[PDB]
Design a protein around this nucleic acid. Structure first.
Lengths: 98, 89, 226, 82, 94, 107, 96, 81, 108, 94, 226
DNA sequence: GCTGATCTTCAGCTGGTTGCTGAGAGTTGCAGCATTGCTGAGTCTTAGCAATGGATACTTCCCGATTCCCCTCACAAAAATAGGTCAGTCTGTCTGGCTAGTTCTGTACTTGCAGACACAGGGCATGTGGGGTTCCTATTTTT
DNA sequence: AAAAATAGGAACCCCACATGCCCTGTGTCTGCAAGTACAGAACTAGCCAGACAGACTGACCTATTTTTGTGAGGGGAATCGGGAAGTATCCATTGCTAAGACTCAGCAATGCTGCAACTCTCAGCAACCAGCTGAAGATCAGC
């Protein structure tokens, strides 16, 4: 019988680890490709500075992390521990985005 | 402006809501108000003018008496009837 | 980019009800009202109603109330129209068109048309049909019944195709239409002029007013080239 | 070239890491698509504003300072890029 | 006693042009005054920032067009840009 | 020659000269271009006209003679673009849109 | 005698007050509250009538929006009764 | 000197504000929380407004000062100037 | 006479002259007072000094002799006034505060 | 070569004044540069608005002090006001 | 306006535990740390630790680690201190004082003191006790051990009363303090001066430093008038 | 419930290194100094209005007690689903080089905007009137 | 007799409309610098390419979390009637805000100069990485 961790403790370990570090949590190349694809619909043959893509990534990580904190608060309000799309929608509606 | 007799002419010429005001002699211009629906006619006049208070047929009729001085609308001795002058016809 | 998808032809027996979708993509779904237009060969195009997905607000043609009901599905970016009590005089092509909430805008993009078959202001388009060669001037007039403060649009419909917008606000060119097309006029008289014709320009041209609550199309104008 | 289907590049573990940084313990299986949509909307807004700023300058390269302006314009001030 | 210089008469002219019969109250008049002032301030400030970023010292119709594009959402920006372009073209011909 | 307002030259109702003066004295730039006041006056006039037409339609739908703040609030809040433009704006005597959550409604 | 079932009169009130536009707080209590609050900052202050009117209208709008957010939070938790915890959650998410 | 005036925002008034917001059922503890949040909001706005008046060397708070305070708190108010 | 920097005259480390130039050329007012750049430089210097001292303390408690963006984030987010001042500000490579909700922790 | 003209040297002087033995990274240097620029823009813009509101054409230390009171929270405003007043008083004595 | 309420004296037998509150009112509760200071006749004022209600952050004196535990209650704006295993040398007065999170700030407002009775940087005050007439000049020196960048504050404590702040940042006058009190000095040498004397000035003056993590007080100076 | 053994992770120490920070040499652009003038801001006085305070009568709402109903909350069963492992696979990353398309810099210059001034018409404040509106009482015909 | 209809005096309200005036927007001319067209330098972002290690992915099983059904009880809603404020309006007071005139101190504008701040560079060291070891904690029996 191999050693197994009960569900929940590895999640708390990951929370502790990722709340202590500051690196970008999304791979750089997929994000840059996504940014280029999105920009394709506003102007053809655009060019991006590397620092521009880095600033976009920093903004996106910060926004998503804050939204996830709000989503966690909403989920806890509903007597849950599992975040669901309804929590995201409620947080974004109260924030004024929807 | 002077839109009150314009109102009284328009609905009669268009055949609108004959239950309150209607014709018997278009040539001379006389018409008869209904003793029952004249309140509805007064209210419809008041909503068009968009006044502050709902007007009764009394306040409606008070206006026609000033028309006699100018001559567009005059009151003859016959219950619920008036008439335009020839010029405004 | 902007696309309004519809369903295929419907074979429906009289007395039943049918619902067709208008799945939309390529734009912010809640920012544009989805308008529904029916087209019969004997009454041209008639405006049915519209739905505003932002607040699910509707407004139907007085001659279509009860017969048609519009529903909005925000999650799938789809709009359905439900027609109840399908009479024999319902066999027509039903178009769903995108129109912005701005008064100046018009029905810019149209669906492919769902062919359903069952087993006030008046627009006057004076010239019914004309013949011309490959290089002349042609003028179409859309004399109106009441006045409309330049809230008139011009549409081009190729046969068996969805109508294509040419002029909106009675003077402004649509998106991608060449400057050959030119509209003018205001009040009650409006005009559409084509600079130089081609074999492509043969189609039917309608004028739509949206200055008042029931939108009314024109009688149509069949243009023939050489 | 032409890029297509790159929002899928924001993989499931990446979203899980982002949620963990937010203190989320359990994540439903439908969260990932919703997060992808939200990120796409946010990116579209910011990139459109940045491209407008770049276009006004008669340039063809989106500089980092344009992104900073676009973010500042939306109440999302960013420090560390100018 | 200092000639307050509001926007009321121009808004009233526009209203009578677009709805010849309906009137407007004083409260709604003040609200629309505030709306015009607010939109003026927003567009002018954003155009000032645009001129500052590009090391320009003058605000031109290009700056105002870019500010309108950045501030108004959806078809509002498109129609406002069309109106401004048409007005400037008409003014240029004098 | 005969005096001609710049608004008349541009075919507008809003004051181009007043907008130019406000731009010059508003601490926005060292200089102000010739066409900038015309452009921004046209934009302001367009926005005013759109809002006023929507408010007048709302007032007529309520069978009222005059536009009151309630009609302006109804016009703005019922349009998503106008709501986004005026999201953080409070309108005096405006009230709120009539909206009840479906859960509160009885079966 | 006749008695309305609970929630019917509340729904009637919701329909009624969402249709009107007048201030829902009496003017005198709000004026007294505003003067009392301003007493802390500067003594012997003075208020224009329009100043108090603007303050009241801003407060009404803020409280109404806050109550809309609170109701959304309460519905999220499968309830129809708003509690202080919903107000707190809405204020926390708004960033206050 | 004025005291305890936060009690002037009565329970029925708060119920009316909730009704305009679409609230159907209201808990008994909502009223004190609402009074607290209203007091906080009013204190912030009034402090900014009083700062604005004090800068102008005035002793009367005008509608312009309140409008300016609300605008600088991102709560633009229309109709008072 | 030998030139004395206005910063030295005011006992400051921030450039009073550069601040004055930015105020004059920044499209803020038709004219700028003499003491306005001095006041502006003093306020800016105080703010940067407070943030830098808090960040340096955070670095020292982390046994580091160099302030990095993480230390700035820790200094700001742990102070309520500084957090309120920079509530809508994102700091690159600053991370987030370590915060776990109580109900997510195991009970026993 | 364009003489970017940042605030780096002054921030380094302040850092050496408060933490004599502590250095700072380039990323933190840029972040503090952005912070200084942001705060300068905020205070200057609000002071300009204050001057415009009172129909004044000049920005004085009074406008800056009122701006500092309005945007800085809590004791931050009090201590910034004290620092600014001290600096102006010392500068006046030359 | 700002007030920090405290409980009355408590008699406790040794070996037990005690807890006292510091209910605070008149300010934004979470923006200010609450610092706890104990005063004994044989040690004078002694710093225990603080708690930051904004993030529940705490920091304890090393010699009081374990002995004291600080807790915050955001709902009631109260801060508690718990002493475990009350040893005989704990019969003293425990003060809770308000201090902002700003480094320049000091302990500005104090609680009345709960007289609980049971059954580094060395900060030197040169004049232990002094006498003066009704209008002379007095000066108190507070030479420090290490270097503190002007993070020194002066306090006046009437007998059987909470201390009152006079000078913070080694030169700045505190709120309500007349300009008769004047602080000076920086680095390691600091001085407090009183120009005009009154019968009120009869009190014990302490100098507190908060430049380093363990805050330390001076021995005090009993100043007597006539 | 109370530890106990086992396994995994995290924290701390020590040596090699490595890329990043701080300081020095060259320089150049902008801050400081010294005049000159003139206008925006400070000071006094007072007109003029709006805020404050009190009174009175009327209307509107608020507060506490009762009843009861249906919503919230506790709890158990089920049934949905997410998490932890693992084998296999696929992709991001790092390295460096080459264009080549884009950005930056320097000149000549030209075109449009600020400044000055005369002046006249647009816009603001205040007034006057038509076409009613409202309000209360009395009078003369019909039902 | 009774009620509906009619008159009428007397304030009053809304929307044009007119009038006086004054100050600000327009017309005209001049000077000059902000911005542009062009050419050439330089610079940096996109593309190519190959390996490879570690992140990602899908299946599987299980535990643990969410959902559903049920019931009790008590909290809040509905009601009501008397009293307590609120409100409208009216008058008097007062005080405080700004207009108008007058004056002049501070700030813009200008030119010259010198030194402080920028760029470029390179040595050295704080931080990072790898390896190792010890403490803390999770997990599964077990008495």
């Amino acid at each position: 019988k191999p050693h197994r961790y009960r569900p929940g403790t590895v999640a708390l370990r990951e929370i502790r680890r990722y709340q202590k570090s500051t690196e970008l949590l999304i791979r750089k190349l997929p994000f840059q490709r996504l940014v280029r694809e999105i920009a394709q619909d506003f102007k053809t043959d655009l060019r991006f500075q590397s620092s521009a893509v880095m600033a976009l990534q920093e903004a996106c990580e910060a926004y998503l992390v804050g939204l996830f904190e709000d989503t966690n608060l909403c989920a806890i309000h509903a007597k849950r521990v599992t975040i669901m799309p309804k929590d995201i929608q409620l947080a974004r509606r109260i924030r004024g985005e929807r | 402006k002077i839109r009150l007799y314009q109102f009284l002419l328009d609905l009669l010429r268009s055949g609108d809501m004959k239950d309150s005001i209607w014709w018997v002699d278009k040539d001379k211009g006389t018409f008869q108000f209904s003793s029952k629906h004249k309140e509805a006619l007064a209210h419809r006049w008041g909503i068009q003018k968009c006044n502050r208070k709902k007007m009764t047929y009394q306040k409606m009729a008070r206006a026609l008496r000033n028309y006699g001085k100018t001559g567009e609308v005059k009151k003859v001795k016959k219950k619920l009837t008036y008439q335009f002058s020839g010029e405004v016809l | 980019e902007v696309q309004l998808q519809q369903s295929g032809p419907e074979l429906v027996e009289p007395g039943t009800s049918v619902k067709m979708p208008c799945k939309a993509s390529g734009y912010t779904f809640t920012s544009y009202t989805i308008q529904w237009v029916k087209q019969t060969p004997r009454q041209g195009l008639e405006w049915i109603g519209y739905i505003y997905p932002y607040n699910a607000g509707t407004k139907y043609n007085e001659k279509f109330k009860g017969k048609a009901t519009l529903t909005s599905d925000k999650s799938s970016s789809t709009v359905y129209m439900e027609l109840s009590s399908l009479t024999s005089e319902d066999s027509a092509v039903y178009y769903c068109a995108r129109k912005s909430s701005r008064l100046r805008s018009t029905l810019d993009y149209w669906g492919q048309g769902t062919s359903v078959t069952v087993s006030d202001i008046k627009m006057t388009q004076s010239p019914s049909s004309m013949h011309a060669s490959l290089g002349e001037r042609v003028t179409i007039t859309c004399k109106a019944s009441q006045d409309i403060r330049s809230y008139l649009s011009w549409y081009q419909q190729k046969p068996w195709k969805s109508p294509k917008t040419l002029i909106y606000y009675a003077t402004s060119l649509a998106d991608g239409v060449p400057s050959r097309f030119s509209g003018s006029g205001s009040g009650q008289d409006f005009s559409l002029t084509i600079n130089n014709l081609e074999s492509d320009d043969t189609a039917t041209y309608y004028c739509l007013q949206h200055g008042e609550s029931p939108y009314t199309f024109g009688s149509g104008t069949k243009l023939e080239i050489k | 070239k032409v890029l297509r289907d790159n929002i899928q590049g924001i993989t499931k573990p990446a979203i899980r890491r982002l949620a963990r940084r937010g203190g989320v313990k359990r994540i439903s299986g439908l969260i990932y698509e919703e997060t992808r949509g939200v990120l796409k909307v946010f990116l579209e807004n910011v990139i459109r504003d940045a491209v407008t700023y770049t276009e006004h300058a008669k340039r063809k390269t989106v500089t980092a300072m344009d992104v900073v302006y676009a973010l500042k314009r939306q109440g999302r001030t960013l420090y560390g890029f100018g | 006693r200092s000639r307050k210089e509001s926007y009321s008469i121009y808004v009233y002219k526009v209203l009578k042009q677009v709805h010849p019969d309906t009137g407007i109250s004083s409260k709604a008049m003040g609200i629309m005054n505030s709306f015009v002032n607010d939109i003026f301030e927003r567009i002018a400030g954003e155009a000032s920032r645009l001129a500052h970023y590009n090391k320009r010292s003058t605000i031109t119709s290009r700056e105002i067009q870019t500010a309108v594009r950045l501030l108004l959402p959806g078809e509002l920006a498109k129609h406002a840009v069309s109106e401004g372009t048409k007005a400037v073209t008409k003014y240029t011909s004098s | 020659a005969k005096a001609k307002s710049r608004s008349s030259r541009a075919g507008l109702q809003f004051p181009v000269g007043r907008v130019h003066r406000l731009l010059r004295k508003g601490n926005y730039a060292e200089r102000v271009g010739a066409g900038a006041p015309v452009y921004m006056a046209a934009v302001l006039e367009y926005l005013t006209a759109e809002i006023l037409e929507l408010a007048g339609n709302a007032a007529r739908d309520n069978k009222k003679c005059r536009i009151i703040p309630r009609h302006l609030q109804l016009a703005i809040r019922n349009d998503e673009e106008l709501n986004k433009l005026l999201g953080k704006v409070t309108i005096a005597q405006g009230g709120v849109l009539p909206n009840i959550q479906a859960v509160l409604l009885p079966k």
